[PDB]
Short mmCIF file of C-alpha atoms (C1' of nucleotides) and ligand atoms in Angstrom, two decimals:
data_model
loop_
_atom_site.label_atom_id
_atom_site.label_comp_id
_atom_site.label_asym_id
_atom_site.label_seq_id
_atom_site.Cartn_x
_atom_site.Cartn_y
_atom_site.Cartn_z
CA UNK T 1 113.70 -175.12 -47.60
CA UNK T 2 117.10 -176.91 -48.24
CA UNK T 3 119.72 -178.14 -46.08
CA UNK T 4 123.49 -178.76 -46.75
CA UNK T 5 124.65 -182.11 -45.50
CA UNK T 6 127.89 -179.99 -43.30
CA UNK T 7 125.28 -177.98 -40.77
CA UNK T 8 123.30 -175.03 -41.56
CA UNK T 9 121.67 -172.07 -39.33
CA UNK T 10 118.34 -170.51 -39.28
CA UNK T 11 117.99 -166.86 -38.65
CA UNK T 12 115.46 -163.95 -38.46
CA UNK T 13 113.76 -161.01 -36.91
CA UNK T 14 111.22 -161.87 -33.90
CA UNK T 15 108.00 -163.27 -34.64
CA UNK T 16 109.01 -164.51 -37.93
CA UNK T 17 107.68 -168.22 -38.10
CA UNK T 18 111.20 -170.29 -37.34
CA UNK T 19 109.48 -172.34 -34.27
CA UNK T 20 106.64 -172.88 -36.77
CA UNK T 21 109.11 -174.35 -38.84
CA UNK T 22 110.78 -176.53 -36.55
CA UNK T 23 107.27 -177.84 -35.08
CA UNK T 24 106.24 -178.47 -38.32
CA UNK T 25 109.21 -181.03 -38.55
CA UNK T 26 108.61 -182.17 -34.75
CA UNK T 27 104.84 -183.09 -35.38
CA UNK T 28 105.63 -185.88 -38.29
CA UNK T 29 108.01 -188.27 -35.14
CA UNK T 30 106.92 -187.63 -31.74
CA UNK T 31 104.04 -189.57 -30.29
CA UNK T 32 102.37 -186.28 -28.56
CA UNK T 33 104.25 -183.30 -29.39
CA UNK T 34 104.93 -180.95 -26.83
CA UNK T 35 104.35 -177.20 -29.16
CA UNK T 36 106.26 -174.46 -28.42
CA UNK T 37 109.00 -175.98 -25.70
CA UNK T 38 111.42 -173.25 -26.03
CA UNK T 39 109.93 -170.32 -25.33
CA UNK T 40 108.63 -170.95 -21.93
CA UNK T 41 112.13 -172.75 -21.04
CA UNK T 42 110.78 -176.29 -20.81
CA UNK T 43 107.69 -176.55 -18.80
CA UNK T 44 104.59 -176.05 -19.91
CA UNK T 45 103.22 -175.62 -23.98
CA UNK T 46 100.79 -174.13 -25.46
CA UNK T 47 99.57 -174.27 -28.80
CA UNK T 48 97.63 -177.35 -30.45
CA UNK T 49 97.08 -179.18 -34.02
CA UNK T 50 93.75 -177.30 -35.39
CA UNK T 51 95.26 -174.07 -33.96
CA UNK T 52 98.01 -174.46 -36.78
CA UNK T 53 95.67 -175.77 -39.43
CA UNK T 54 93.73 -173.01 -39.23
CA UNK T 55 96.26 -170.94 -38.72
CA UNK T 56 94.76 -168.12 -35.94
CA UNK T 57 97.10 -164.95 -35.25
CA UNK T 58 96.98 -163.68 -32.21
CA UNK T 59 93.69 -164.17 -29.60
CA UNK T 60 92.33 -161.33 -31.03
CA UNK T 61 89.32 -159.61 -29.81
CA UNK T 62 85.75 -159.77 -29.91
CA UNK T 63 82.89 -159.43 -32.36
CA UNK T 64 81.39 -162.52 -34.51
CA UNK T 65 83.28 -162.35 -38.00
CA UNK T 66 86.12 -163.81 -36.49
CA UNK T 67 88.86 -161.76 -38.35
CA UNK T 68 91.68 -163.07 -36.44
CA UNK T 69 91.52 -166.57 -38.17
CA UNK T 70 93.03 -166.94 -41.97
CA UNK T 71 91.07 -170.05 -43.23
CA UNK T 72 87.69 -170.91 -42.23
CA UNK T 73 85.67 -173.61 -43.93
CA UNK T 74 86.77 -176.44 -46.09
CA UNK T 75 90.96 -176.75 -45.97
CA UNK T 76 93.78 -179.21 -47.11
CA UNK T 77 96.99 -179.26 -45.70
CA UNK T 78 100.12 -181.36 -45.85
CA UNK T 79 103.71 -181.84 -44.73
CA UNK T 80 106.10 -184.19 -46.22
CA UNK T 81 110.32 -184.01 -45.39
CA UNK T 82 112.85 -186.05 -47.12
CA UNK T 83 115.82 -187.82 -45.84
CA UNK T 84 118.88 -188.99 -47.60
CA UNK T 85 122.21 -191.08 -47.10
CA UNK T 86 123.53 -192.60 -50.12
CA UNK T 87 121.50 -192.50 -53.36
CA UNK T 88 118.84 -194.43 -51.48
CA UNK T 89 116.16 -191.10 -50.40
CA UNK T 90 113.15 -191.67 -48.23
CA UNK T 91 109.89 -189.37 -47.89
CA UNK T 92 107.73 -188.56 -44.65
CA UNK T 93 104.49 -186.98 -44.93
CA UNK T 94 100.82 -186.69 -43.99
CA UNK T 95 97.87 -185.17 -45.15
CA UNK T 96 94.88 -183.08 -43.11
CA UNK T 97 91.71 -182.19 -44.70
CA UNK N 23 70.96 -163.52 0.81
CA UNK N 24 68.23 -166.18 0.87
CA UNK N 25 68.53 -167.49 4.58
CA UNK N 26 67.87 -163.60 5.09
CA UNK N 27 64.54 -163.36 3.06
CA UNK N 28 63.59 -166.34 5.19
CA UNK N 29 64.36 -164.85 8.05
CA UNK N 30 61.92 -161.91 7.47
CA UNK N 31 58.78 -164.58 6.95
CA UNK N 32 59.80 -166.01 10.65
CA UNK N 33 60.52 -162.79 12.50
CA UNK N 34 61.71 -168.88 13.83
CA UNK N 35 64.99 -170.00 15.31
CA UNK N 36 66.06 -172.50 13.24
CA UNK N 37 66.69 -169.53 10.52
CA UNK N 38 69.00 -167.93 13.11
CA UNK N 39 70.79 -171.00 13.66
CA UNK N 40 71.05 -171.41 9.87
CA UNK N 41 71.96 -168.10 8.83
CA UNK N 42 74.52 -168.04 12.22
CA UNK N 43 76.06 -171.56 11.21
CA UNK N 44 76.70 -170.41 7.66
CA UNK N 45 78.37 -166.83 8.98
CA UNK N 46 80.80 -168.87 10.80
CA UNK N 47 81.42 -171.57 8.55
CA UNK N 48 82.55 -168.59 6.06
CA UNK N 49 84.77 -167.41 8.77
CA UNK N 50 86.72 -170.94 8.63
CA UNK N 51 88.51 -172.01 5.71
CA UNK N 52 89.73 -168.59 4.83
CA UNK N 53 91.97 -170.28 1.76
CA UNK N 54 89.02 -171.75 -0.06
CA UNK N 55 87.43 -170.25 -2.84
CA UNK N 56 84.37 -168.98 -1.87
CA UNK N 57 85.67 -167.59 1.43
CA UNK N 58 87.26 -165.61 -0.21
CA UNK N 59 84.99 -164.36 -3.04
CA UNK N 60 82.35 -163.57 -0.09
CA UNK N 61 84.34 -161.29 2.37
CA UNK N 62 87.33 -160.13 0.11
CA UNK N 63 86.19 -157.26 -1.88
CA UNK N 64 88.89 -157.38 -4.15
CA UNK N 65 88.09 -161.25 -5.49
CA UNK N 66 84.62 -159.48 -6.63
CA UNK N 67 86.10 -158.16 -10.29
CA UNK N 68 87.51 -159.90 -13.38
CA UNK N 69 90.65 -158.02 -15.16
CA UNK N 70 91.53 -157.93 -18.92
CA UNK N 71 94.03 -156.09 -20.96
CA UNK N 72 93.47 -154.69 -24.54
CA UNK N 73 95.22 -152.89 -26.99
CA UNK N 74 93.91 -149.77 -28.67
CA UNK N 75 95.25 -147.47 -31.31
CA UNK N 76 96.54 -144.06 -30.64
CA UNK N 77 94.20 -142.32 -33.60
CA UNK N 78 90.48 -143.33 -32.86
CA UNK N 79 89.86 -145.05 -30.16
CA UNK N 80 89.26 -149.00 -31.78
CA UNK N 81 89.72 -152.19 -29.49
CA UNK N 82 92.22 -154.51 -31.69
CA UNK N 83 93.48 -157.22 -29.24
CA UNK N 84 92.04 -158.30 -25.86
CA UNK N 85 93.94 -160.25 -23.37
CA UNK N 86 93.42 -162.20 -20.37
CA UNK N 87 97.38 -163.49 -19.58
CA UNK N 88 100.25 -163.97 -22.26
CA UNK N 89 99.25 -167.39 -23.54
CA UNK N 90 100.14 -168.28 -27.14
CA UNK N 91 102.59 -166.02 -27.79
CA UNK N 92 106.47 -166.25 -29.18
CA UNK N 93 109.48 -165.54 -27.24
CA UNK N 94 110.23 -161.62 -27.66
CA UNK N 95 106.53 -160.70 -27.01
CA UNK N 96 106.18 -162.55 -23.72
CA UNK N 97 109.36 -160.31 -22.47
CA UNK N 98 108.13 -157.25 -23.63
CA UNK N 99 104.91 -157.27 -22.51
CA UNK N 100 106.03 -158.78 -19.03
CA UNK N 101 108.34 -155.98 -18.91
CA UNK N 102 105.96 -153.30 -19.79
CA UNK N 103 103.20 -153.80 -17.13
CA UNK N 104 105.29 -154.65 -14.53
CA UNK N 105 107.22 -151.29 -14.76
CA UNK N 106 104.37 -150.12 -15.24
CA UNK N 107 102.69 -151.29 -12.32
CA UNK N 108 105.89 -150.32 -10.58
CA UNK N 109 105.91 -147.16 -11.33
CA UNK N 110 102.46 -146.34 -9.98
CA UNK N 111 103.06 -148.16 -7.12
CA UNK N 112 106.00 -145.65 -5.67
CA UNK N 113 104.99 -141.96 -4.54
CA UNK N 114 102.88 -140.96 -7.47
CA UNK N 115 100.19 -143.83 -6.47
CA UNK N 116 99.36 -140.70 -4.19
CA UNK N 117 100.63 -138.11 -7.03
CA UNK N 118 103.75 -136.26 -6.68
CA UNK N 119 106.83 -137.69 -8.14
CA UNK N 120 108.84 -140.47 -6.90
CA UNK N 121 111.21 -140.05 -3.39
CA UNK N 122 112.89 -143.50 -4.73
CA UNK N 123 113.72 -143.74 -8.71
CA UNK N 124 115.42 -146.95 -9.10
CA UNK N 125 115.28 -150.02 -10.92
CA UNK N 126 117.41 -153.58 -11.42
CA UNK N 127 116.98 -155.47 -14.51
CA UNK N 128 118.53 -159.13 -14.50
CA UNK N 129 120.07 -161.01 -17.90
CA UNK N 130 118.78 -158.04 -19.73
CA UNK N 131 117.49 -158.92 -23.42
CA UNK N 132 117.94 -162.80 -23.21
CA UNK N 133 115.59 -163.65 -25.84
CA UNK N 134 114.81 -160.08 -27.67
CA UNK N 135 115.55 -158.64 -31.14
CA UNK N 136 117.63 -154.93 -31.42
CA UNK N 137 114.06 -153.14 -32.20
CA UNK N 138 112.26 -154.61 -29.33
CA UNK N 139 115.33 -154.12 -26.96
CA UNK N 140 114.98 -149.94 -27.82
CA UNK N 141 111.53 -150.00 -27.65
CA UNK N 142 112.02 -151.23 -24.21
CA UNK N 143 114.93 -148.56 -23.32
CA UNK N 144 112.41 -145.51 -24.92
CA UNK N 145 109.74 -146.76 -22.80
CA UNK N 146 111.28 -147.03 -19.52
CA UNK N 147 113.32 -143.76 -19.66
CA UNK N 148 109.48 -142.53 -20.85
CA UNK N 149 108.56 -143.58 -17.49
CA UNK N 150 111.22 -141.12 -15.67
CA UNK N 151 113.24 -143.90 -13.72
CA UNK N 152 116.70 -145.04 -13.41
CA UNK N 153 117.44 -147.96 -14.98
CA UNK N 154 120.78 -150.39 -14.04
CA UNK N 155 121.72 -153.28 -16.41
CA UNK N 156 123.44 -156.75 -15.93
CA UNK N 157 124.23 -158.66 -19.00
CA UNK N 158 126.76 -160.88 -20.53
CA UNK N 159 129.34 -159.57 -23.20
CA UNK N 160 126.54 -160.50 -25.55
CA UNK G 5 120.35 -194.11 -31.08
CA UNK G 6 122.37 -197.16 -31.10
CA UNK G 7 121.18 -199.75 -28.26
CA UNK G 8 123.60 -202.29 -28.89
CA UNK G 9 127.40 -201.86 -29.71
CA UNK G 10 127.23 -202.36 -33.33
CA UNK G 11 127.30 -198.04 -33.81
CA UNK G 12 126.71 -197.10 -37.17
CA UNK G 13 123.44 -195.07 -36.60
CA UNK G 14 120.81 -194.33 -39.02
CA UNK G 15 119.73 -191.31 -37.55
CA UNK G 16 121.58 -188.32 -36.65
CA UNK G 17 120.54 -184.90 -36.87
CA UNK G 18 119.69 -182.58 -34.25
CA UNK G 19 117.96 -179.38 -33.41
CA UNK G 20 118.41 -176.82 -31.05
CA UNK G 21 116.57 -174.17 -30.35
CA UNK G 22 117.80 -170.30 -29.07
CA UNK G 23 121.07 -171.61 -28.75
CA UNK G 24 123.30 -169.22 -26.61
CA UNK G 25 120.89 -167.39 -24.96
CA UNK G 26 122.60 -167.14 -21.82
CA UNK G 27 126.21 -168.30 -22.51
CA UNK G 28 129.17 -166.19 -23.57
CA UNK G 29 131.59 -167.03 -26.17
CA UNK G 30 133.77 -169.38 -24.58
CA UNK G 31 130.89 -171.65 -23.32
CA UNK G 32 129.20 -171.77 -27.23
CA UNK G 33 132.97 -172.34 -28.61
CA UNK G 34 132.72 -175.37 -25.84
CA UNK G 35 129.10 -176.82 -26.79
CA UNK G 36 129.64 -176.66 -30.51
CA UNK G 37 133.10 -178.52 -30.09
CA UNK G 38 131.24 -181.24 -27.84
CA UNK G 39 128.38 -181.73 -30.43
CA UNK G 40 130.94 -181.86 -33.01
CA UNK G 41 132.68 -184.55 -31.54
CA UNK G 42 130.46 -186.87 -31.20
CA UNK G 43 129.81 -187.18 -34.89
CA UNK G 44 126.12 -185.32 -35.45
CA UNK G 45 124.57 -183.15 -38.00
CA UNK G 46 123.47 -180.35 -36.17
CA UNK G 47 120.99 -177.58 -36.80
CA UNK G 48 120.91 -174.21 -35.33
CA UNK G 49 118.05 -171.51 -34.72
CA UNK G 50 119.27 -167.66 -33.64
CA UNK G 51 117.48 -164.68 -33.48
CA UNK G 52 120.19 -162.72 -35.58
CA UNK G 53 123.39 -163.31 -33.01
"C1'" DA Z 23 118.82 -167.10 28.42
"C1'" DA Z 24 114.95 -170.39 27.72
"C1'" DA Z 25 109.98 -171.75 26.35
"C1'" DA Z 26 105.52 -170.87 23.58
"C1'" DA Z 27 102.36 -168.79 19.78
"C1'" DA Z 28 101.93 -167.41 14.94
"C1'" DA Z 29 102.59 -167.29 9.75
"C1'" DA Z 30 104.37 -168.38 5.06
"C1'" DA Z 31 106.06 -171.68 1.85
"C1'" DA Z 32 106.56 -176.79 -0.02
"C1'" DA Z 33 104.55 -181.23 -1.03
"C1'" DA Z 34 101.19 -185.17 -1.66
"C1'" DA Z 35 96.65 -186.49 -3.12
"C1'" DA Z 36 91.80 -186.65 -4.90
"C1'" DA Z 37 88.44 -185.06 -8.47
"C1'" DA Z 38 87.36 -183.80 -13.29
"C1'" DA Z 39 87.83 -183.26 -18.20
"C1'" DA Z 40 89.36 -184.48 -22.81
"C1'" DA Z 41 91.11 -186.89 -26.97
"C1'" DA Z 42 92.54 -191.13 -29.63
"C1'" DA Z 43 91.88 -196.16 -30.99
"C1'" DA Z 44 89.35 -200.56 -31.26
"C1'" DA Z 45 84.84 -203.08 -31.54
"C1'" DA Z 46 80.20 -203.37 -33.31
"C1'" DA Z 47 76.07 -202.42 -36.11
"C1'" DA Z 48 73.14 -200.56 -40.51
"C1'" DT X 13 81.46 -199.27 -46.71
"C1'" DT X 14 80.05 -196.06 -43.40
"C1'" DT X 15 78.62 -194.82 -39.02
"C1'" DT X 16 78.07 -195.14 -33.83
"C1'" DT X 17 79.58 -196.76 -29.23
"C1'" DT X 18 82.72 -197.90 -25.91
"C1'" DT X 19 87.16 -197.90 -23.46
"C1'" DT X 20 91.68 -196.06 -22.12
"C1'" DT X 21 95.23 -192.89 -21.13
"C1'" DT X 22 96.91 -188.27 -20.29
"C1'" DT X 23 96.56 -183.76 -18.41
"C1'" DT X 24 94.88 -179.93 -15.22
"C1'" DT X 25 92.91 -178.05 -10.93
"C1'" DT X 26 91.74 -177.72 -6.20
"C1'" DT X 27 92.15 -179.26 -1.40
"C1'" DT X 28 94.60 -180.50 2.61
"C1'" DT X 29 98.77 -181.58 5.37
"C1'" DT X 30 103.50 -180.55 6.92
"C1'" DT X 31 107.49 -178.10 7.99
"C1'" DT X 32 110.53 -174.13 9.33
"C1'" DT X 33 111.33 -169.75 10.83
"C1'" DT X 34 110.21 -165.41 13.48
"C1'" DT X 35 108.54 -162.82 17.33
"C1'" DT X 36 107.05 -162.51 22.15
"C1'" DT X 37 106.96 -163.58 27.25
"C1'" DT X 38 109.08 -165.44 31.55
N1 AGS O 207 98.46 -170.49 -31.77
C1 AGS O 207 98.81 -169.21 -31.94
N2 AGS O 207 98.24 -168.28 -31.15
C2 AGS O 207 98.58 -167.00 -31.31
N3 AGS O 207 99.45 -166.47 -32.18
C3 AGS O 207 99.99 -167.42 -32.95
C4 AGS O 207 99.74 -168.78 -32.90
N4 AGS O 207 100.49 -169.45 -33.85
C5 AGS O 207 101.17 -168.50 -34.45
N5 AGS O 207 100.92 -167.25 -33.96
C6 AGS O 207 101.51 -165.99 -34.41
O1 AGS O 207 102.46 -166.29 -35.42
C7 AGS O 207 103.72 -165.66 -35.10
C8 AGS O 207 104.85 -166.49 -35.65
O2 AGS O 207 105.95 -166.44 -34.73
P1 AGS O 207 106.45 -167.77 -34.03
O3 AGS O 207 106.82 -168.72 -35.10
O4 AGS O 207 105.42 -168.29 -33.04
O5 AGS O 207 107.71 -167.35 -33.18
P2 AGS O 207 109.03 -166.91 -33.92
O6 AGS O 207 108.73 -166.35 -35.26
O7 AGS O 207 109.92 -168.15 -33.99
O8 AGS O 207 109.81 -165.85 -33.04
P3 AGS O 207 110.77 -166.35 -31.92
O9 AGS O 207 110.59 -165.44 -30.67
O10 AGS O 207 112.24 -166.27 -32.42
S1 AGS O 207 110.33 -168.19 -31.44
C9 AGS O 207 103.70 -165.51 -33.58
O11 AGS O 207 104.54 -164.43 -33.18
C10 AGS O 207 102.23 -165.20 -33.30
O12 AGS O 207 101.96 -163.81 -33.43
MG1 MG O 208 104.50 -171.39 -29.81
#
DNA sequence: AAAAAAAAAAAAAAAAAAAAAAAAAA
DNA sequence: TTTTTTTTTTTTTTTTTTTTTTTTTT
């Protein structure tokens, strides 16, 4: 995902993934990130870290197989965004396994 | 239950003290826990919510609350049981239709897509009400 | 962003998110002028309005 | 017209649980 | 070099206390 240096806009339909988006930004600066802020109007949040990692849609229901989670069992993951001001460019990122 | 049993082997008063002492402690505190889960029939049950589709009858998402969620889906489902709930609650609780068919919705679609905001108009003129809107010019 | 006087800041972008959800034109108009004059790269989230 | 009993909401505090970072040992 | 142990800080939950208003009786 780009971003042009005179301000930009995000759209979409509802449940898309934009607030996934934007926490995945928040989580690389903040000391404890506060997920999901927005929605609830700024008091209480809700999701966590290994939530996302593994990335689980929806509670679900019951049962054993676990159907409701995407990746299960050994996983890499990272996140890197990239600032610029004048030629000079700098890189943020981390790495989960 | 057990101070009763006991009572049976003594048919001696310390069990009636016991058993008296622990009846009247239970009718103090009435806003602590297990006052209330001992004389309140209603705080004997658990509730849940689940989702099932309309062909078959499968269980495909069980809920306790609306935790997790994004911001259109918390509205709807709000929305949805509470005029639900709503509309039981009025005359038909005790069948018949409703004597009083009226509803007020505040800052109507704050947060909520086109699609989820008819889904929500089909559903509550589904439910036979009146509805009355307040928004913005939005 | 800039505790001292010297200005010149190194950081300056910001995000909102559901912007306008309970504001009518005039009031967004307002916002987006304020933001603007401050001198800030903005970034803006909308569920298609 | 004035005095007393009752009930619902707001606020402070104590107890409990959990996750991250540094020190120490095989 | 890898592993375990310990401490520290942050968050949530439940209990109790306090206040204001409403209704009734004299
Ligand atoms: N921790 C989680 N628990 C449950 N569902 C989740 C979780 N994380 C992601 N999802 C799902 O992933 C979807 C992605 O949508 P989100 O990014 O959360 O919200 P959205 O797409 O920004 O829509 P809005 O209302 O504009 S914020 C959600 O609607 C959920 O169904
Ligand atoms: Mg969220």
């Amino acid at each position: 995902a780009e971003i042009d240096p005179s301000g930009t806009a995000v759209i979409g339909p509802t449940g898309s993934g934009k607030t996934t988006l934007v926490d995945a930004l928040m989580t690389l600066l903040c000391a404890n990130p506060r997920y999901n802020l927005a929605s609830t109007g700024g008091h209480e949040s809700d999701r966590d870290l290994v939530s996302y990692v593994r990335g689980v849609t929806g509670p679900g229901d019951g049962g054993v197989e676990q159907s409701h989670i995407a990746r299960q069992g050994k996983t890499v993951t990272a996140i890197a965004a990239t600032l610029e001001r004048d030629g000079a460019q700098v890189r943020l990122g981390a790495v989960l396994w | 239950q057990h101070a009763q049993r006991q009572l049976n082997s003594a048919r001696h008063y310390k069990a009636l003290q016991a058993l008296v002492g622990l009846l009247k402690d239970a009718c103090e505190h009435s806003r602590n826990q297990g006052a209330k889960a001992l004389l309140d029939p209603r705080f004997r049950l658990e509730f849940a919510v689940s989702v099932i589709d309309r062909e078959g009858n499968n269980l495909i998402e069980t809920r306790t609350g609306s935790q997790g969620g994004s911001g259109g889906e918390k509205e709807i489902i709000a929305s949805y049981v509470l005029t639900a709930s709503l509309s039981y609650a009025l005359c038909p609780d005790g069948s018949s239709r409703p004597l009083f068919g009226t509803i007020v919705l505040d800052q109507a679609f704050s947060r909520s897509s086109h699609a989820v905001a008819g889904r929500i108009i089909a559903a509550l003129r589904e439910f036979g009400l009146h509805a009355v809107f307040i928004t913005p010019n939005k």
